[PDB]
DNA sequence: GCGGACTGCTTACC
């Protein structure tokens, strides 16, 4: 196999990198890099290097990467540009591995861990490190073994060995549940003391030294407090045996009171799985807890235990230990779903740059555009100091608050990507620029041809239409990945309705799930033997088709995320190709696009429909349009209709065989406005909805901007087995709205769009008589707690105090003095709950650490002092009063006059 | 007292 990189380090003169060699075996590698840079030299000077704009450049090699530096520095003084790459490691990486790096993810070591550190002070704040850790458990993806570090003296306590024969029973058998296939991975290791143990880790570290390392919080907690335990134990010379170079660096952050530090291992990639899944799961969680997530993730129960965590040690070290393999082990299995790991060694090794580079898509953009030019014989420009200017973006219709029954929705594939490449959009494609008249005459088709030369956008620009643009050239190829991977994941979740209509019929028989692969659609061979399989293998082949999706999720929304990066990189004036130009050249051109469109729809219905003059797009955000198909289904009439299924086969047939022509030809026209290199918009059918055939359902509703809710029935080629509610922006699809709540809201919806106002009131009385009766962590709101300290004036609120900091500085004054109870962290998330007055707290409201109980020590007062009816108003009256008012309907039934009869 | 205009804060959707 060829060869590649594991973690590549500059320190000083040197890089220090760590590889897998052509045989497959780990090495370590100095290489006194010798860095060239480049600067302008006269168009005499014959050369073989050009900058993107086609200066000549000379090449100059450096005795060592400080010079290249200094250099650098002179340069400046001078005020003469220094061309090339700068960042040293990206220029050898682009060097050492001049080809497509083929990875073997088997050869890297990926290593998984959590410590544990009793603590009566609280808290135990990493930079202090005071607590003795008194375990580790050490997950090793080469040796897939879990290592256990179990420290049974403490001068917090001493406990027996844990038991592997107790810890794999259930927890009604008074086990601990350990999942029975890693409880043979498991390698157990007890220690007399602390010094041995984490002596004996460090030697274990090096001979198993992680390339990337994850875990839950490591980066904020194990790895800090690690290193700070060691250092404060064995010195820091010791404490550096945790870098493979024994370089690390501690910087300070100290965040007001206490202080805060951001260690750096150098050698080793630190990839955080909170972190990764904060920039990839796209979700937003009320809580961050690992027992969350997993819960969230994975459907499993929260490891439960009865007194707080700083005694678990003392009373069960039996579970104490248990929970600390468990909790590794969860993040393994939210990685086998997630596969975030996966994605980051994909784009980590695409783009040639350190793994842990994955979380700036400007640095990765920087050395997939820097290694791309570098192929062409290209020099990259200097980064420039730029200031930051506020630049308009994409185009919102405003909508008419009211119902909509049928409704059909068209959006663009991939919008801003394709606009880069339909009008070749690039630092060195720029040809020039014209005199632009305003968007709407450009809109209208009333504004002049702007150039019979160049590609342009309505922003002004112009762009060569026959140059290959460096920009295009590299988000084409990503994208070319991202349909790929949507193609995979679409199929799934087609596949995964089909196994969800043979759950309709289970045929009672013992057999095994079919061999099939998700990624592509069923055959009728397949399908054939679907509906005669059992609920055994059709609900093991749901959980599969499902996994298989989310794994094609992943792939695609995070390598949409990364091409659109590169758009707002151009607006970004840290990037090395900032220019606003083209960043403006993007977002204008989507604003025509979109507008237009609108135009070129409403013609096509207006004619074709009858009636002309009335606006048939309803709303529009950026690249979609939502048109309004009660005069499509009118002009048939609802009675030719057999079924629901019927009318929704109908305006997909509609669509595909008339729609989209028409807007083609749209699209082509405006292509041929512009004169652009190339025809890129392609608008295809999103959703379909409104409500079951012969219902009293509305079908769907807009409040605002941002705010809608549909019924839909088929939704990109997959046509759901059961109606799937689309709710946009409305507080169901809120973290801070309290859990309870969104259910109670979510219902109210979809009463209101599939069977209408009398099944709305009839839901909503039982709501409201039923209310007080649950659980308040389900009904208390959410919210991120930042800048507390500035807000916190002698323990109480300061002018402008937020509502939920408030509920925060109360609870402070509640449990004060009382160490062991949970403080608030912040910059994470609190619920929050309102008090009814008079209350002993002495405040509007209360908060506390959100994934958590309240603590017992006033838990029962908080319960008594819950003011229920401001919960109700606020969170649940007010928002359906929003929904009901918009769609014209009322929740509940006014007063008639027909109320005076019996 | 209390609603309307404004601002800070949070969280959604492209
Ligand atoms: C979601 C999102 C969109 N956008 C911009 C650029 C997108 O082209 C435009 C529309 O985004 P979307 O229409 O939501 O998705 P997409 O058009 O990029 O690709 P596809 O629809 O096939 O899934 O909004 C961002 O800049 N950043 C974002 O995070
Ligand atoms: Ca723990
Ligand atoms: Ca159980
Ligand atoms: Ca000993
Ligand atoms: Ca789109
Ligand atoms: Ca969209
Ligand atoms: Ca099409
Ligand atoms: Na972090
Ligand atoms: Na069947």
């Given at each position: 196999m060829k060869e590649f990189y594991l973690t590549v380090e500059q320190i000083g003169d040197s890089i220090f990198e760590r590889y897998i060699d052509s045989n497959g075996r780990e090495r370590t590698r100095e290489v006194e890099y010798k860095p060239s840079l480049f600067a302008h030299c006269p168009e005499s000077q014959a050369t073989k290097y050009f900058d993107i704009y086609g200066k000549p450049c000379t090449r100059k090699l450096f005795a060592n990467m400080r010079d290249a530096s200094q250099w650098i520095k002179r340069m400046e003084d001078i005020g003469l540009e220094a061309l090339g790459m700068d960042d040293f490691k990206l220029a050898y990486l682009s060097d050492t591995y001049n080809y497509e790096i083929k990875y073997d993810h088997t050869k890297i070591r990926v290593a998984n861990f959590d410590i544990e550190v009793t603590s009566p002070d609280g808290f135990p704040e990493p930079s202090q490190?005071?607590?003795?850790?008194?375990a580790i458990t050490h997950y090793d993806s080469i040796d897939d073994r879990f290592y256990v570090f179990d420290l049974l003296n403490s001068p917090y306590g001493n406990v027996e060995e844990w038991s592997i024969e107790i810890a794999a029973k259930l927890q009604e058998q008074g086990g601990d549940e350990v999942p029975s296939e890693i409880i043979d991975k498991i390698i157990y290791m007890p220690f007399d003391n602390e010094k041995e143990l984490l002596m004996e880790y460090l030697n274990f570290w090096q001979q198993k030294t992680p390339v990337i390392l994850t875990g839950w919080n490591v980066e904020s907690f194990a790895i800090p407090y690690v290193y700070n335990r060691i250092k404060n134990i064995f010195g820091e010379s010791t404490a550096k045996r945790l870098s493979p170079h024994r370089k690390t660096r501690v910087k300070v952050i100290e965040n007001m009171y206490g202080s805060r530090e951001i260690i750096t291992l150098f050698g080793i990639s630190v990839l955080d799985y909170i972190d990764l899944y904060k920039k990839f799961s796209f979700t937003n969680q009320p809580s961050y807890s690992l027992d969350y997530i997993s819960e969230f993730e994975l459907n499993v129960g929260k490891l439960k235990y009865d007194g707080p965590i700083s005694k678990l040690r003392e009373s069960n070290h039996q579970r104490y230990i248990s929970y600390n393999i468990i909790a590794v082990y969860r993040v393994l299995q939210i990685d086998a779903k997630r596969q975030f790991i996966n994605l980051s060694l994909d784009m980590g090794y695409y783009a040639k740059i350190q793994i842990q580079s994955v979380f700036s898509p400007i640095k990765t953009w920087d050395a997939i555009i820097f290694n791309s030019l570098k192929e062409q014989n290209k020099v990259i420009p200097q980064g420039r100091s730029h200031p930051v200017q506020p630049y308009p973006g994409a185009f919102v219709k405003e909508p008419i608050p009211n119902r909509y029954k049928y409704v059909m929705s068209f959006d663009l594939t991939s919008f801003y990507p394709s606009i880069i490449r339909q009008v070749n959009i690039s630092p060195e494609t720029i040809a020039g620029t014209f005199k632009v008249a305003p968007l709407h005459d450009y809109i209208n088709a009333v504004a002049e041809r702007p150039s019979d030369v160049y590609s342009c956008s309505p922003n002004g620009m112009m762009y060569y239409k026959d140059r290959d643009g460096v920009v295009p050239t590299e988000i084409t190829k990503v994208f070319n990945q991202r349909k790929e991977h949507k193609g995979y994941m679409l199929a799934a979740q087609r596949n995964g309705e089909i196994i969800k209509e043979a759950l309709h019929n289970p045929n009672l028989s013992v057999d095994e799930p079919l061999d099939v692969d998700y990624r592509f659609d069923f055959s009728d061979e397949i399908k054939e033997k679907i509906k005669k399989l059992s609920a055994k293998s059709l609900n093991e082949m749901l959980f599969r088709a499902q996994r298989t999706e989310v794994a094609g999720m992943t792939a695609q929304i995070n390598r949409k995320l990364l091409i659109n990066s590169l758009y707002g990189a151009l607006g970004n004036v840290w990037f090395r190709y900032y220019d606003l130009r083209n960043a403006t050249a993007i977002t204008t051109f989507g604003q025509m696009a979109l507008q237009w469109i609108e135009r070129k729809v409403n013609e096509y219905l207006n004619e074709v429909c009858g009636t002309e003059g009335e606006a048939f797009v309803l709303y529009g955000d950026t690249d979609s349009i939502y048109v309004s198909a009660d005069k499509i289904i009118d002009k048939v009439g609802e009675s030719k209709f057999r079924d629901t299924n019927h009318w929704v086969d109908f305006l997909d047939k509609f669509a595909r065989e008339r729609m989209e022509p028409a807007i083609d030809r749209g699209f082509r026209e405006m292509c041929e406005y512009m004169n652009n290199k190339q025809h890129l918009m392609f608008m295809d059918r999103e959703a379909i909805a409104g409500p079951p055939l012969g219902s009293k359902g509305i079908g769907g509703f807009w409040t605002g901007k941002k705010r809608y809710a549909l019924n839909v029935w088929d939704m990109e080629g997959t046509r759901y087995a059961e109606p799937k509610l689309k709710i946009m922006g409305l507080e169901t699809q809120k973290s801070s709205t309290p859990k309870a709540v969104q259910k109670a809201l979510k219902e109210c919806i979809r009463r209101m769009l599939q069977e209408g106002e009398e099944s709305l009131q009839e839901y909503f009385k039982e709501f409201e008589k039923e209310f007080?009766?649950?659980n308040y962590i389900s009904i208390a709101s959410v919210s991120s707690a930042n800048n507390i300290a500035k807000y916190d004036v002698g323990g109480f609120p300061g002018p402008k105090c937020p509502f939920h900091i408030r509920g925060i500085l109360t609870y402070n004054r509640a449990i004060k003095g009382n160490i062991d109870a949970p403080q608030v962290v912040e910059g994470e998330k609190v619920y929050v709950l309102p008090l009814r007055e008079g209350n002993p707290f002495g405040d509007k409201c209360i908060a506390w650490p959100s994934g958590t109980e309240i603590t017992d020590l006033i838990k029962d007062d908080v319960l008594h002092w819950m003011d229920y009816t401001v919960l109700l108003e606020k969170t649940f009256i007010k928002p359906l009063e929003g929904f009901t008012s918009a769609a014209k309907l009322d929740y509940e039934k006014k007063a008639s006059l027909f109320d005076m009869f019996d």
């Open positions: 490190a005071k607590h003795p850790i008194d007080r009766q649950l």
